[model samples]
Target chain A: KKWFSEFSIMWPGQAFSLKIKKILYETKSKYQNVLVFESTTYGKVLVLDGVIQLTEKDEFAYHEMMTHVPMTVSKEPKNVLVVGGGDGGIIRELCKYKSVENIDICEIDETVIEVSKIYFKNISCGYEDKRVNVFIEDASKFLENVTNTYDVIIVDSSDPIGPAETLFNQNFYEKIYNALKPNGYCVAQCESLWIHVGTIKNMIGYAKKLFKKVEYANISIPTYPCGCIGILCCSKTDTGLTKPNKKLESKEFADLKYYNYENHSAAFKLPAFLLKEIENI
Target chain B: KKWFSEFSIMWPGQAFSLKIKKILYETKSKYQNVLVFESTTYGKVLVLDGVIQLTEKDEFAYHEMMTHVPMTVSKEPKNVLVVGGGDGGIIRELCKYKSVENIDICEIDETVIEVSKIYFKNISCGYEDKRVNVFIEDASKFLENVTNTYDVIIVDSSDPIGPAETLFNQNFYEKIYNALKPNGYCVAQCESLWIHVGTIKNMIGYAKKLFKKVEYANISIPTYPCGCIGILCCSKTDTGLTKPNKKLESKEFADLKYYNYENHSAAFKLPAFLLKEIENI
Candidate 1:
C-alpha cells in the first residue's frame, strides 16, 4: 500500500481518480454481486459484483483471443458474423482482416450495440465501418439462411446462466456449421477458465464431434471476475488460428488492434491441463 | 487462487508449503519491517506486513528501476551498498557490476533472509561471492559509521510505516548524504503509487532539498498487491538518470530473471498523476 493510504483502510472503488461517474449494471448473481460502471477509460466495466470483469478498454484481450485463433486457420476468410458484441468491440477487431468482405452483426439485444455507439466509442470502431452490416436479428435463425458461403463466424455471447444460455446448445453449433464456407471457422467466446471449465469442456466436446479441429486456448484476463478467459474454436478446416485479412479494412488499420500476428499464433497454444480436456474427450 | 486451494483454505497460515531456511539483516533500522525472501525462481520475493509485498518472477520491474536508473545516472559506479535485500536478490543484481568492488547488505530481519536461503537457493545466486559483506544492523543507523566513498547507496526499504518510518525521515537522508561519495547517487524503494503518494512525495521533497537531483520512477511488480511499484532517485550530481553498467552485465542478463533494459528504461517514466505532482511541484 502507498504511504498516503491511512492506517490500512481500503478505498471505495480504488480507482486512480477516486470518483464515481456513470453506473452500468448491478445484480446479486448466484455467486458474486455484479456491478457494471463506466470508469475513466475502462468503458462499461462489469465488476462481478465488485471486482472488475470486462472493461471496454481491456476487452480486446478476451475478444481478440476468441476471434483470431480461428480466423488464422482460414486460407481465405471473406465474410463474418458476430452474434452478441453489442459494444461492437469484437467486430471492430474482426474487421481488421482484408479478406473479410462484409461483417453481419446479428445481435439480439440492441441495447448492447446502442450503448457501444453512445457510451463506449473507441472500442466500437468496427461496427461503425460501412462494411459492417448490422442485422438486429436473432443470431440462431440468421445462421440458418447464410448457407456454406461465409468463411468465419464469431459468437460474442455473454455468460451461461443469464440471457446467453441459448447460444450454448448443440442445435446452435449445427446452425453455425451450416453457415460456414467449406473451410469455414467459428470462434466462440467461452467463459472464465476458473469458473466455466465444465461448460467449456462440454462445448468443446460437442464441437469436436461437429468440427474437424476443436481446441482451447487460455488468456490471462485480470479484469474478469475469475481473472482468466478461454476461447473454443470449431471448424471444418479451421486451424484454431486467424490471419489478418488485408481486405478487412483500410491498409492503414491492419496493425491498429489486438488480433495481430503474435496473438494470432499463441491463441492456439493451450496449457497441458486444458489441452488434455479437449483432446481426450 | 489455484484449483487445490480449497484444501489449503481449511487453515489460514498453515505451514503446508512454507519453510524459513536462511537469515540476514540486509538493513536493520530503528524500526524493522523491510525484508527480502528468496525462494525457488518463484521464491525471490519481498515481504511487508507478513504478506509478500513484491517479487522477482515479475519483480524485474521493481528491481531494475531501483538499481539501474541510479546506476545509469551515476555513470561508472564502482562501490555500492545495498541496505535492504538479505535474500541476495539485490546483491545478485548489485554484483552484476564489473567495476563494482564491494557490497554491504544491511538487513535487520534475520528470519526473512534465513528462511529464503533454503527455500530460494537459486535466486540468492552466490551471495557468498567474495565481493559480498553481510552486516546485521539498523538500516537508518547503518550509514552513520560509513564515510563518503560508495558510488551508489540503495535503501530498498519496505513501506515507510512501523519500523521503517525512521528511514523516511529527513535525518536518515542526512546520514545517506554524508555516507555518499561527492557525486554518489541513492535510490530508495518508495512503495506503491496507487496508495502511497504522500509519503513518497515527502521523501522526494527531502531528497530534493538535500541532493542536487531527485527523480521518481515506477515498475510493474506482479506479486505486489497493486500492479505497480515506485523508486525515488536522489543524487548530488546534476545528471539524474543512471546508465546501465556496460562493463559488467549486459543490460539483458538472460540468466538474470527480471530487471532487463526495456523495463529498465520504462520504469523511470512515472504515471500521469505522478508526472503532474513532479511537474506541479
Candidate 2:
C-alpha cells in the first residue's frame, strides 16, 4: 500500500520500487492492466502490465530524446507519426517544432489515452494541438496503409512484452521503413543496454537490413529499470544521425530540458565494451 | 532468503533489490555493517550499511570512470592515492597504466578488504601489485599528515550517510587539495545527479572554493539506485577537465572495458535541466 514494486523478465533478478503516496487509479484494460499512483518523491507514476511507463519527475529525459533525436536529424520533418505513445509525451515534444506540420499517434488501447488525458494533462497537452491526428488501433495495421508519408516516425512503445511484443520484430522495422519518405528517419524505444543488449543488437540488425544507416542512442531516466533506455535511429539515406542536421538556434531547443547539440552527439558515443558487443551489428 | 533489498534516505522513496543466490559473508566491521552475497544475474554483490557498493556485473563502469577520468587528465601522473576503496576495484583499474609508479589506498574497514581478497579474487588482484601501499585508517585523519604527495587523488567513497559521511564535506576536499602536488588533479565519487542534485550542487560549491577548475561527470551503473553515479573532478591549475591532456594511445586503453577518449569528454556534458540546476556552482 505504501510502495509499488516493478520486476520484469526483461531485467530478471532485479526490482525497482517507489514509495506510493496514494493509488490514483487502477484498472484492467482490454489489452493490459493499467495503474496510476502518486509517488512520494517521484511525483506521479503510470504503470502498464506492472512495468513503469513514466514518472512526472523524469519523463522529459525519455520524451525529449525520443522526439528530438530523429526530429533534429531529419532536414525538416513536416509529417510525423508516433506509435504506441498513448501518454502523449512524444506529441507534446513534437508540438514545439514549427517545421512539424502534422502529428499522428496510434494507440492500441483507448483507455490509456483517456486516462492520460485526465491524469497526465501536462504530458497529454499535445492532444489539444491543432496538428495532431489520433488513431485508436494497432500500429502495425495502421502503418499498413501508410507508405512514403511520414518524414519521421517515432515508436514510443512500452517494453518488448505483452501488447508491445510485436513492435520489436524485423517486420515492424520493415513497416516503419516503407512508411517513411525517401531520406526519412525513424527512432524507436529499444529497451536498456544493460539488460536488453541482445534485443538491441537484434533490433539494430533488423533496422540495418532495411535502412541505409542505423545508429543507437540512450537517455538517462531514473524511473526506468536500469535508469537508462536506448533509442534506435534509422535513416533511409546515408546522412549522419549523430549530429543534428539543423542548427539548434533555428528551433525551440532552449525550451527542451534534456536534448541538445552536445548531448545529441554524446548519446551515440557508446562505452568501449558496448561498442565491442554490438560492433558487428 | 533469496533476495537482498537496499533503501537509503539519500534516495528517499526509492529502493533497489537484487536476487540473492547465496550469502557468502556477513559481518559487522569496526565502522560499518558489511554483507557479501552471490546474486543470480549480477554475479557477486557487496553491501555496506544497507547500501549496494559494487556488483561483479557492472563494477568496471564505476572503477574505470573514476580511475581513468583524472588519470587521463593529469600529465603522466605517477603517484596516486585512493580513499575508501576497500574492495580494490579502483586500484585494479589504476594498475592498467604503466605510467603509474606507486598506488596508495586508505580504507577504514579491513573486513571489506579481506572479503574482497577471498570472495572477489579477480577484483582484489590489485593487492598483489608491488607498487601498491595499503593503509587501514580513516582517510580524513590520514590526509591530515600528508601534503603535496600525490599527483592524482581519488575518493572512491560510498554514500554520505554512513562512516564515509565526513568524506563529502568541504573539510575533506580541503585536505585532498593540500595533499596533491602543484597542478595536480583529484576525482571523487560524488552521488548520482538524478537523486542527489542538491548534494552535488553543494559539493561543487565546496570544490570550486579550493580548485582552479571543477567539473562533474557521470558513468552508467545499472546496479546503482539511479543506474548511474557522478564523479567530481577538480584541478589545481586551469587545465580543462573535459578533454584528456594525455592521449589514449599511449596507455593500455584498448584493454579498458568502459572508458575511452570519446566518452571522457561526453561524460561532462550534462543535460540542459541539470546544467541549469547546478549552473551557478
Candidate 2 yields a Cα-based lDDT of 0.88
The CA lDDT of each predicted structure is 0.60, 0.88
Model 1 residue B144 lDDT? 81
> Distance from true position, residue A217, model 2, in Å?
0.8
List candidate 1 stretches off by more than 4 Å.
A1-45, A48-51, A54-281, B1-48, B54-56, B242-254
TM-score of chain B, candidates 1 onward in order:
0.78, 0.96
Q: How much of the real interface does each model capture, measured as fnat?
A: 0.00, 0.80
Worst 10 residues of 1 chain A by lDDT: A1-10
Interface Cα RMSD, each model: 12.8, 0.9
